[PDB]
Ligand binder design. Structure first.
Ligand SMILES: Nc1ncnc2c1ncn2[C@@H]1O[C@H](COP(=O)(O)OP(=O)(O)CP(=O)(O)O)[C@@H](O)[C@H]1O
Ligand SMILES: Nc1ncnc2c1ncn2[C@@H]1O[C@H](COP(=O)(O)OP(=O)(O)CP(=O)(O)O)[C@@H](O)[C@H]1O
Lengths: 345, 348
């Protein structure tokens, strides 16, 4: 069946809306991004810390959030010339305004009843609360999706997300799913090329690849921008591209070492997040993990930029299939649980 | 199938827990009442008006609320020798802490995911939000249940709920379901007998029945609800026996109810009374005298115990959800049309 997934993370720049086809495999049919208006962003941020009149404020803020979400859903469907009747459900994360599992609560707003009213599509939402009710942290959610996609190959695999920072899901046969942070991802390379060339990032890692790794600098680094700038002053003036090359090597070494310490027999590293598009970084990771095949998740039909939205569409599917949606090995929950709640159209 | 219903009103005394069998008819199998501790009542009340730190406070309060609800479900099932697997779903009203349909929102707490986790039973909850989303007031919800129970091809009926206050569902054949608020129910009689005798309420209305209606006082009251409000009225009248005041308060409710009811439905053939007021023998007697063309009787005579009507409505709403049948009455709520109400939190 077909599902929409709706995600809006804590950066509040906009909403990711994806449309998947789900059967034996998960396939991305379409995707859409909708920027969040400045006014909505502030009112949400103002709810992310304790303040007065929160019940009423959150109730009114979520109405605006839902209207925007419904607009985005309508827009994606229009683009695909698809009737909402062709979609089984929307999996909506909502918007986190408070997440405090130590006090046994997590709060995502996003009035799913209104989302169903406006879209005419069944909504599955409120995915974190059941994991928390069962003693979990209510996060992370995506490793369950990683496991369903890539687990059970009888193969030791790592699903590596390279965003600003790096994190990995380890899928080892006969072992619990594991998850941990690997180190910096794109954060410094982005910071360095922005500072030096006004680029948001290093496309294909081409700037890094044109430079030459400085081993003195690399050694200092291994033993943010001001943090980096502090290091560069302690060396003669280095070409900016050599700096970039050294920053790439820094990420490649930190990721590969963290991964291999936890899963030395890793056979495949599947890379998602924007770092999967960094050709130079991907090449170096492969060199540093010579017993593992390193490839983008794209090679498996999962576009690396859309992992999160697709996970939420998938969670809608899991709910309706009466299958568990959490990964208690990573959330700390007592066991597998059905995640979410159904608000029918 | 079998369903649990969980009701907790704005009076904040306790939770109604009911077990029904639902097929062509709705039948009460078992019921349970669980008092709410003062500390929880106080903390809930404090969330009913705007205040500080509400998100975190509500989250902590609802966890205690859910723990109590789950124990109540457990006890009912223990008494009935029933496993949670024998229950199809719980329909939970939750606890209302803010209701402002004019601002298009209504808020019931009661973490349904936690309720499903603790009970091991599928939970259907959050019934008001879809009605509000469709432009309605999100209330009242019970008239749709009243309709399913008592709506008939040939009888003008009024289903009258007498709690602290009174509200009625008008069921006219070939006509839309109607609903409205009929005035005070037990609120003043309860306050007056508590003040004068330290009783929680006037059992069978016997104290009121021992008194005599004062027509001057009745006329003043009707020319207009709490104890200071009454004391202010008593100040404008000579000193009356306490029982006469109680008798006059009963007559106030009886006349206000009958007059609103008869004005809206002059051809009323049956008044079916539920809520605790149905147990007030003296009040029931006066309602019957004031509506002589209608048969005035407890819902018990129609197979629905009057104390458990509201809880049973929420059990019924869980059934309506699972059957994808509408749960609201848009003519009474003002919603755009019929809607499936609620959200499913599966036990899994
Ligand atoms: N073609 C490309 N070449 C190199 N890096 C790329 C790239 N496309 C994306 N990236 C990297 O991915 C980052 C964005 O991916 P990310 O996983 O962090 O998304 P997000 O969390 O910001 C939404 C960019 O800042 C950049 O570092
Ligand atoms: N045996 C009896 N004799 C007389 N009155 C009785 C009674 N049993 C119950 N009552 C009355 O019923 C009242 C409770 O009414 P009910 O239970 O229907 O209200 P409720 O629990 O729904 C709260 P609300 O007032 O918000 O509706 C008591 O306060 C009392 O006045």
């Amino acid at each position: 069946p077909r599902y929409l997934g709706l995600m809006s993370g804590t950066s509040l720049d906009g909403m990711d809306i994806v449309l998947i086809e789900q059967g034996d495999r998960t396939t991305l049919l379409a995707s859409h991004y909708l920027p969040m208006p400045a006014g909505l962003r502030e009112d949400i941020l103002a709810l992310c810390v304790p303040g007065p009149d929160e019940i009423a404020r959150a109730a009114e803020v979520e109405q605006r959030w839902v209207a925007l979400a419904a607009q985005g859903v309508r827009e994606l469907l229009l683009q695909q010339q698809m009737s909402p009747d062709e979609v089984r459900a929307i999996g909506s994360h909502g918007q986190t305004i408070r997440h405090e599992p130590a006090r046994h609560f997590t709060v995502q707003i996003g009035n799913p009843a209104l989302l169903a009213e406006l879209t005419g599509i069944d909504v599955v939402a409120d995915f974190r609360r059941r994991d928390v009710a069962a003693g979990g942290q209510g996060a992370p959610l995506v490793p369950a999706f990683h496991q369903a996609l890539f687990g059970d190959d009888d193969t030791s695999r790592a699903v590596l997300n390279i965003g600003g920072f790096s994190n990995v899901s380890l899928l080892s046969p006969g072992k619990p799913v594991r998850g941990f942070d690997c180190g910096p991802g794109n954060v410094l390379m982005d910071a360095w090329i922005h500072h030096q060339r006004g680029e948001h990032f290093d496309r294909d890692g081409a700037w890094a690849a044109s430079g030459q790794v400085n081993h003195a600098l690399l050694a200092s680094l291994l033993a943010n921008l001001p943090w980096l700038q502090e290091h560069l002053a302690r060396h003669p003036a280095l070409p900016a591209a050599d700096i970039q090359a050294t920053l790439l090597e820094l990420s490649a070494r930190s990721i590969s070492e963290s991964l291999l310490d936890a899963q030395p027999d890793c056979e495949e590293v599947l890379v998602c997040g924007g770092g999967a598009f960094n050709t130079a970084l991907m090449k170096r990771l492969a060199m540093l993990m010579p017993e593992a095949r390193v490839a983008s998740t794209d090679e498996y039909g999962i576009p690396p930029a859309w992992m999160e939205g697709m996970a939420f569409a998938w969670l809608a599917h899991r709910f309706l299939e009466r299958l568990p949606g959490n990964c208690p090995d990573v959330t700390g929950a007592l066991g597998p649980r059905t995640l979410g709640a159904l608000y029918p159209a």
